[PDB]
Amino acid sequence: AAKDVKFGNDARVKMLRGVNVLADAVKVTLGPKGRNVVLDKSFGAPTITKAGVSVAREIELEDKFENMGAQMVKEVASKANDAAGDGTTTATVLAQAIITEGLKAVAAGMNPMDLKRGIDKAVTAAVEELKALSVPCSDSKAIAQVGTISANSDETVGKLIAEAMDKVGKEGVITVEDGTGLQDELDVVEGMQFDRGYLSPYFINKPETGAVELESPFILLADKKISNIREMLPVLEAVAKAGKPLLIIAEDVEGEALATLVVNTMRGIVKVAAVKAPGFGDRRKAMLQDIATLTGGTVISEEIGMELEKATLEDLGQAKRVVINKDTTTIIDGVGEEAAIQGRVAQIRQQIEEATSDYDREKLQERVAKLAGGVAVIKVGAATEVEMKEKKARVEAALHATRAAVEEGVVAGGGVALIRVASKLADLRGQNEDQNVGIKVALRAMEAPLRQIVLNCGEEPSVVANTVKGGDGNYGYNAATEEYGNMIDMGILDPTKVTRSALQYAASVAGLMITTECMVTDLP
Amino acid sequence: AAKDVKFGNDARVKMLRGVNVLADAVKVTLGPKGRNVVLDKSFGAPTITKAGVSVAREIELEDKFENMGAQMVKEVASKANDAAGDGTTTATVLAQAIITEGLKAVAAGMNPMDLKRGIDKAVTAAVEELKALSVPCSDSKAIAQVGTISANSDETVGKLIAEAMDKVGKEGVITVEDGTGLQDELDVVEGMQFDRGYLSPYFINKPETGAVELESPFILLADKKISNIREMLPVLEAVAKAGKPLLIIAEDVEGEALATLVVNTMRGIVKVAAVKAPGFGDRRKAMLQDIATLTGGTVISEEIGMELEKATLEDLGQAKRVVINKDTTTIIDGVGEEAAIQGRVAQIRQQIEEATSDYDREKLQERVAKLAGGVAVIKVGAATEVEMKEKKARVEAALHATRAAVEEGVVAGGGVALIRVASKLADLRGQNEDQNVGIKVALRAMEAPLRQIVLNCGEEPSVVANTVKGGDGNYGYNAATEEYGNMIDMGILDPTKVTRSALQYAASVAGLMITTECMVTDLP
Amino acid sequence: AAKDVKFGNDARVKMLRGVNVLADAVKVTLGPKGRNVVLDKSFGAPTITKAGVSVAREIELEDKFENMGAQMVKEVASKANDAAGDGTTTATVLAQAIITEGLKAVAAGMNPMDLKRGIDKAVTAAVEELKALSVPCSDSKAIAQVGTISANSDETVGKLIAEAMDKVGKEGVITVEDGTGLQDELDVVEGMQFDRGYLSPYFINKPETGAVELESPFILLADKKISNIREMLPVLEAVAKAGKPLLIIAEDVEGEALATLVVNTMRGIVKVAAVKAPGFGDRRKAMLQDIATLTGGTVISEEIGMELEKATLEDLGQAKRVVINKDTTTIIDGVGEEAAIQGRVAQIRQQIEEATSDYDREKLQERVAKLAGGVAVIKVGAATEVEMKEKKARVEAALHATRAAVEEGVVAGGGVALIRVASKLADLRGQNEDQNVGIKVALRAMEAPLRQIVLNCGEEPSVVANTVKGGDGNYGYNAATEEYGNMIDMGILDPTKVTRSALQYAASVAGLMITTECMVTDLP
Ligand SMILES: Nc1ncnc2c1ncn2[C@@H]1O[C@H](COP(=O)(O)OP(=O)(O)OP(=O)(O)O)[C@@H](O)[C@H]1O
Ligand SMILES: Nc1ncnc2c1ncn2[C@@H]1O[C@H](COP(=O)(O)OP(=O)(O)OP(=O)(O)O)[C@@H](O)[C@H]1O
Ligand SMILES: Nc1ncnc2c1ncn2[C@@H]1O[C@H](COP(=O)(O)OP(=O)(O)OP(=O)(O)O)[C@@H](O)[C@H]1O
Ligand SMILES: [K+]
Ligand SMILES: [K+]
Ligand SMILES: [K+]
Ligand SMILES: [Mg+2]
Ligand SMILES: [Mg+2]
Ligand SMILES: [Mg+2]
């Protein structure tokens, strides 16, 4: 299509206009006294949210140039969210400050590229300063605090994530779903448990419900399917010579073998249950090995010379109790020694260097949690669907925030961190005057979060800013109680990772964005 | 469709106007104090770039005639990019100048054709003068400098390309992709390395991680599948008489074969590994020939008289050491003679210089880089996707600029080269006055790059130009430090190839373009 | 659709207007001081050309009637190009002159049909007169000159096609393609070359690229395909006793025989190559006989009593050198005596004197050209694609022009020839006054070319016309050097064929066009 082209001040003003539309559209959700946004959707009912990224994503402008600007600044929120999962609004505001002040510096006639350079320098130094200021977050109290703040000061979330991480372990895997009831409910699975229930409902035990429990059970593992039942002679007879109940694991077992199983179990000669393999292809075997080590038995595999026939009482695994229900399989206690299990945890460390980032991390934490650890599922309660969506979003985000807080530590919230590191980099300089101006632009922009929060609280931002800048250390302004004090002692802490990320991303996009001298877009 | 037609000055003015829209759209991106351009995209987010070609490709006008002009001059930047990969803007500016003064001369009533002739002669002579002026750049310092300048004065890129070219070789193959982290990372793989790791991790060697190393290994390769292993009697038994370890390569190997193999390695009679085929269909074979020749053995194929049974140790390949892990396989040094690998690099150089033009180059260069000349892969680091695209693009262009610099040498940047060869061609004449005017058009137009740079720096161009012409040799104006001096000592070098290419292309298209007397297009 | 109809002076004026649009659009490209035209293209970048036909083809008008006229006059340029390949503008201008002067005569109230009659007669006499004035063009100099003039006075092209025809032969085949490099490059293939490359790329020789050359090669030729390979005992045995390499030509060769063949070449016991039959049905056999005659061997044929098995070294052919590549097969020197070729060429001469006169003439002449008359491929060098297109086009046209010059001879350029034959037909009369007006219309129109060229040079056309008519013989006006003189001695030569063609076509189409009294077209 024929293109519309614009140059210089015209284009820059246009862009800035679009950017500011997006920014103003996002900013209303910042701070403890922030406000929500409703997004219409072509299909169903609209969405209410406080999460900046969503509103940014929904934003699109009619004026092609304004559209361009907004569509470029959206990447701030998007990348921020994709990276850490919180503080996206902060990032956006930073971006706006850098872009505005930057363009102002360009209007003085200064070299844009050098401005970008200065900004980049300042931001790098700031990142190092943050990495230094970062304080480790280990106690359940602090974690509760981060979770609370990331959920917009809702301590329910704090205590919830607290109980979760406390029970599973500080690194263990936690997931969250839409709840059934109105109140938040936490489900926790301890020890070895996985999907796929029993095959034949014909099996029953001492309790009801169809779930089968076994006393001092024996475990077998196989790679292939089975069809013959006479072929199970060397094993079954042995078990028939022991009297002890048996458990079998493979991808499947056909109707006739299961029939034999049901008949022999019903006549009461031996109690046996059968359950399909957990995963697919390589993964199911990779898990079968660890299950074997946990039980104490040895894996049998058709892909190796060892056949289904050759089966010994040492190849069989051992446990104290096993329970299998309709959908899930559960092992209570494997006789595998603590040294063996610990060694398994050792060998697991090798499996980390194959990311495949969060997919490898999720599968790895999944298989690891089936050891001494555990799995936590948070079911978020709400009255109506909108409440459900927003609440779940906030809870997820809170989880990500606590995770990042554990990973890279925390710094004093209320955006006082940026003020502190700027005030520390006050003496930072560049290779020439314009670059110095760039440095000053970045630093000046670093005050933006706090003052924006204060603006959203209906209080004079310049004043609060200056009064906070006048202080030292973790001195900051608590917006909820409208009083100054030590932010950490008041429990307002932002994960270092999210702040660092915000600053970096915003600095990148804005730094490039202020280097525009020409724009080409489609003609209307 | 019914056509609109225009003659003479009307058409020419229209054309010039279109050309000038494109030209101005490109021109803003020239020089160290140059500025960037934003291109809207029909699909996703907009693009920031400094690449003249990109903006040129994106340009299209509403007035059919202006459009004709612009769409004709875009080919300059395009052909320039396809040829050298840098200096496209320079070519564009040259074209604009030539077109303007040319059209002025035509409006003076001079014969356009003779103008073309004069321009062409002047340009040829200029090219000869440049190839004469060309100064070779072999050393790491200078290469670092040209790579640096092509990357808009970013010495990170220069030093990076330097380390690359140093490790792989000045002619060896280098590739570059978008990185994962924020900082640039360089990986270099020496010898033979490619995808597809082992299938069964059950067999292992001295190291951990599952990776297996072999001592003076023997290599096998097959085109089709297999099922029997007893049919491999004549080879395996022979190896059992040799003791040397074996490797197998095919599309895959079946379960029972894997069983026999794993058992045989576990019992410790012979250590052997098997890996799936690298490519697909013809490609995997085309590479299999190369691996066979590198090892020294001969390819076995079912489509030829040689069967799966018939296998000897002369067709079988040999190497000194091989390491294979989960996903990739690596051979360091094949015992295949240097004559074999050399003959093969010859043959591959032959097979690339035929296939055309774009689709083939990636797979073919992939096949080329896998020999004794290692392959270096540069991972470009960036904060956000936009920065990634622009930085990566600039890096590729810079790589091309350095390669072209190696191929044809360098001359003093700042476009002073053109000024100098112009000052040298002062006594050049033609067969008549009009051709002299053409020559003069070329010569005067050759000042355009430098003066344009100075103009972009916000300095008076005529003055700087005259002060540079007043000097001699590599005397030029460094715009970054805003000071005159020896361009070479300042590290401002333009590859001769890019300069020559620019001038020639611009000369062709403009030379033709100024001979227009009629234009025909569709009706609006 | 409902029709718009127009009569008499209205219609004629409309028609004339359209005609003049096309005419004015074309005339600008006439002469050495001619100018170019730009044609927009729906897909990619526009085309620059001097070729009248292209411009004529692109023209189309909105007014249905004007459109009608132009669309009728396009046929002149089209047929002219299909016939000779040059002089199309000349034809067009003649057409315009005839149409205008004619329409004036019709508006005088004279009988249009009689005008047609007169024009036709005058033109007939003129063509005969041209046949008389026609001077043979045999020497390399004259040919070069014609090539130069047809290439818009560029002696590079003249000398190039001259060298082409000189190396290849006055009867041999010459082709032209887009070059790879920047300079014009001539490739010449000596001795028999045709389609169909190798079958299996598996076999290779001393050179690379996959193309195989043979040393003092031996050739066999067959009519049918094969499936068995052992039955070729009498052949293979011979080569197995001789060691000399073999070449085979047949309809095809199946998979297993080709497999044995390639394996046979790989083990290195016998060097052999295989290539598909040249033509189809009658042509493949008819030429296979010729290959047999040139090599010295005898054709083997299944359709004749001699079997594939019974084959002796007397039936088998021999050659000096053979090179066969991916698509083409080439034999350098057949051992067949010089006398042998002549007799076959004789029989072909007998096959020429038959009915079917077109397609057969082409097949027969190619087949005749397949002997000592070498093949030339001209690779046209240029910097960019537009230059490439225009230059290649001009080169083809020049080639056709020289071919025609050789075929039917040459006459003095500058359009002085037409003036001469007009002045000769001054005393020509018809059957009535209106027809006299017709012949006079033709004659007056015949001055148009010269007058138009001078008009394009910007000098008074009437004066130069009169000064040239005032002279005698080949005295004419050279526009390039702006001086009068003997045109033949000045190297301005026009093929008689192209001029004759121009006059004839224009006379036909215009002659018909001026007899219009009604026009019927669609309603807008
Ligand atoms: N009670 C409080 N007093 C002072 N500052 C607070 C308080 N609660 C939160 N903040 C500050 O507000 C910021 C969080 O704002 P908000 O939760 O509205 O958006 P965000 O988390 O920055 O981004 P996202 O849109 O991803 O949620 C934090 O940086 C925090 O320091
Ligand atoms: N610091 C400097 N001082 C003087 N001249 C410079 C400096 N940096 C670059 N140049 C000149 O600028 C030119 C390169 O400009 P730039 O990299 O902006 O675009 P380009 O490479 O010409 O075109 P493109 O990159 O779009 O293909 C070089 O010819 C070089 O001589
Ligand atoms: N230097 C010259 N002096 C005089 N007449 C010339 C000269 N050059 C060419 N001509 C005349 O111009 C005619 C050819 O013109 P031109 O090559 O411009 O177009 P064309 O061949 O008529 O048609 P086309 O556009 O198809 O090439 C020839 O008949 C020749 O006599
Ligand atoms: K928020
Ligand atoms: K550039
Ligand atoms: K022409
Ligand atoms: Mg939040
Ligand atoms: Mg550059
Ligand atoms: Mg011509």
Swiss-Prot record, chains A, B, C:
CDD domains: GroEL (cd03344). The modification N6-succinyllysine is found at residues 33, 50, 116, 276, 320, 389. Keywords: Acetylation, ATP-binding, Chaperone, Cytoplasm, Isomerase, Nucleotide-binding. Each subunit is composed of an apical domain that binds non-folded proteins and GroES, an intermediate domain and an equatorial domain that binds ATP and is involved in inter-ring interactions. Forms a large central channel that appears to traverse the entire length of the cylinder with no obstruction. The central channel of GroEL functions as two cavities, one in each ring, that are separated from each other by the crystallographically disordered 23-amino-acid C-terminal segments of the seven subunits. The entry and exit of polypeptide seem to be restricted to the apical end of each ring. Modulating the volume of the GroEL central cavity affects folding speed in accordance with confinement theory. Small proteins fold more rapidly as the size of the cage is gradually reduced to a point where restriction in space slows folding dramatically. For larger proteins, either expanding or reducing cage volume decelerate folding. A stepwise reduction in cage size results in a gradual loss of cell viability. It comes from Escherichia coli (strain K12). This is Chaperonin GroEL. ATP binds at residues 29-32, 50, 86-90, 414, 478-480, 494. Belongs to the chaperonin (HSP60) family. The keyword Cytoplasm applies. It is an enzyme of class 5 (isomerase). It catalyses: ATP + H2O + a folded polypeptide = ADP + phosphate + an unfolded polypeptide. The keyword Cytoplasm applies. During the substrate-folding cycle, the two GroEL rings separate for effective substrate binding and chaperonin activity. Ring separation is triggered by ATP binding to the trans ring of the asymmetric GroEL:GroES complex and avoids formation of functionally impaired symmetric GroEL:GroES2 complexes. Activity of the GroEL-GroES chaperonin complex requires Mg-ATP. UMPylation of the chaperone by SelO/YdiU negatively regulates its activity, and may facilitate survival under stress conditions. HAMAP family: CH60. Pfam families: Cpn60_TCP1. One of its GO terms (molecular function) is ATP binding. Together with its co-chaperonin GroES, plays an essential role in assisting protein folding. The GroEL-GroES system forms a nano-cage that allows encapsulation of the non-native substrate proteins and provides a physical environment optimized to promote and accelerate protein folding, probably by preventing aggregation and by entropically destabilizing folding intermediates. Also plays a role in coupling between replication of the F plasmid and cell division of the cell. The gene is groEL. Phosphorylated reversibly during heat shock. Can be UMPylated on a tyrosine residue by SelO/YdiU, probably under stress conditions. One of its GO terms (cellular component) is GroEL-GroES complex. It is found in: Cytoplasm. One of its GO terms (biological process) is protein refolding. Its EC number is 5.6.1.7. Changing residue 460 to K: Temperature-sensitive lethal mutant. At nonpermissive temperature, the rate of general translation is reduced and a defined group of cytoplasmic proteins are translated but fail to reach native form. InterPro entries: Chaperonin_Cpn60_CS, Cpn60/GroEL, Cpn60/GroEL/TCP-1, GroEL-like_apical_dom_sf, GROEL-like_equatorial_sf, TCP-1-like_intermed_sf. The modification N6-acetyllysine is found at residue 116. Its main location: cytoplasm. Signal peptide: none annotated.
